[PDB]
C-alpha cells in the first residue's frame, strides 16, 4: 500500500515531464487545400529519415472515400477541429484527418494527419 516515496514530493514535475513529453507527434505535413503533399516539415523528416525527395511524396492514402464528402470539407473550410478514427492494423488505431490551422477568420491551406509506426 504505502511503503515510502520521498522523491514523490520533490518529483512533482516528473509526472508532468512524462505527460508533456508524450504529446501527439502524429507527423507534421501540410497539404495545400487538397492532399497535395509536396512540402514536408524539418521535424516530420526526422521521424522517417530516409530521403529529401521521397519524404515529399508517398503520403496520403488512408483518406477514406464517402458519398457525403462535402460534409468533410466543411471541417477544413471553417476553423473547426476534427475527430480521429480507429483503423488499427495491429492495435495501432490509425486516424487520418485533415485539420485547419487556428486563426481569427478566413483560413487557407490544410494539414494532413497521419499515424504510422516505423
Domain ranges of the chain: 1-118
Phi-psi region of 22 (alpha: psi -120 to 50; beta: other; left: phi over 0): alpha
Give which of 26, 22, 18 is closest to 85, Cα–Cα.
26
How many Å separate Cα 12 from the centre of its chain?
29
Element housing 31 (H / E): strand 29-31
Give the residue carrying C-alpha cell 507527423.
27
| CA distances for 15 relative to 6, 18, 24, angstroms | 14, 6, 17
Q: What is the CA radius of gyration of the chain?
A: 19
Burial 57-93 (b: 16+ CB within 10 A, else e): eebbeeeeeeeeeeebeebbeeeeeeeeeeeeeeeee
Give which of 114, 29, 118 is closest to 64, Cα–Cα.
114
Whole-angstrom distance, CA of residue 118 vs CA of residue 79: 31
List Cβ neighbours of 35 (8 Å cut-off, separation of 6 or more).
Answer: 59, 60, 63, 98, 112
Whole-angstrom distance, CA of residue 26 vs CA of residue 62: 14
Whole-angstrom distance, CA of residue 81 vs CA of residue 58: 25
Beta-bridge partner residues of 112: 29, 98
Helix, coil or strand: residue 11: coil
Are 72 and 92 a contacting pair, CB within 8 Å?
Answer: no
Domain 1-118: which CATH class? alpha beta
Method: NMR
Amino acid at each position: 500500500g504505502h511503503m515510502g516515496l520521498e522523491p514523490y514530493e520533490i518529483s512533482t514535475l516528473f509526472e508532468q515531464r512524462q505527460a508533456m513529453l508524450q504529446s501527439i507527434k502524429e507527423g507534421v505535413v501540410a497539404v495545400d487545400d487538397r492532399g497535395e503533399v509536396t512540402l514536408i516539415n524539418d521535424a516530420a523528416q526526422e521521424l522517417l529519415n530516409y530521403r529529401k525527395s521521397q519524404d515529399d511524396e508517398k503520403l496520403s492514402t488512408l483518406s477514406h472515400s464517402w458519398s457525403q464528402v462535402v460534409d468533410v470539407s466543411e471541417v477544413l473550410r471553417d476553423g473547426t477541429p476534427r475527430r480521429d478514427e480507429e483503423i488499427t492494423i495491429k492495435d495501432r488505431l490509425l486516424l487520418i484527418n485533415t485539420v485547419p490551422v487556428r486563426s481569427n477568420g478566413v483560413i487557407i491551406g490544410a494539414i494532413s494527419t497521419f499515424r504510422d509506426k516505423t
